[PDB]
Amino acid sequence: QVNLKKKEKWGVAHIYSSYNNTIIHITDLTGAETVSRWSGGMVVKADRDEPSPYAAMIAARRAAEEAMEKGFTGVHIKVRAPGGSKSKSPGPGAQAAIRALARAGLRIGRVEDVTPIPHDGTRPKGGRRGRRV
RNA sequence: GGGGAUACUGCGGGCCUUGGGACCGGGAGAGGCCGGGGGUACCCCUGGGGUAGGGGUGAAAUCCUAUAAUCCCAGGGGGACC
Structure with a gap:
């Protein structure tokens, strides 16, 4: 129980967002x-x-x-x-x-698009022609 | 079968330098080969956290997950690719 003067406790929200779901963490x-x-x-x-x-x-x-x-x-x-x-x-x-x-009232600090981008690329799915839907 | 001509072609000789080849110089370039060093990303394993879903679709399900998944964190390894 450190003597906290600031009560400015800062955490990190990792937000995994996709086209099928979203995870706040x-x-x-x-x-x-x-x-x-x-x-x-x-x-x-x-x-x-x-x-x-x-x-x-x-x-x-x-x-x-x-x-x-x-x-x-x-x-x-x-x-x-x-x-x-x-x-x-x-x-x-x-x-x-x-x-x-922000509505909930947490002080939002700095935001970052931490998206893993490849400098090479493994092969993606779909094949050569992709999704022919 | 002879005789004649000699521009063009051929054959022989000689000269040339414009075509081409050689050389030199400073540059350019993802040309190639060989070596070394790296970059993220991805997958697996380990350990920590944290619990009830994740994934995917037009919508779903198969599948993964309560032996602890998805997510996050620290390490190790791997093969491809730049």
């Missing part, structure tokens, strides 16, 4: 201790509705209120679209979730 400043992890698939029951900025805001609110219960007055943001051979655009859930966090 709040940790300490390191990232090695988790404090809240909420998903579209927790907050709803329709798979097609998992990605939505609706239910993204809800997952964000639940994770936020849990974290600001536990302390953590502010959060840095690390939004992450899927990997290198997959898509490199996050989705709507990202901006929706950061807006939801």
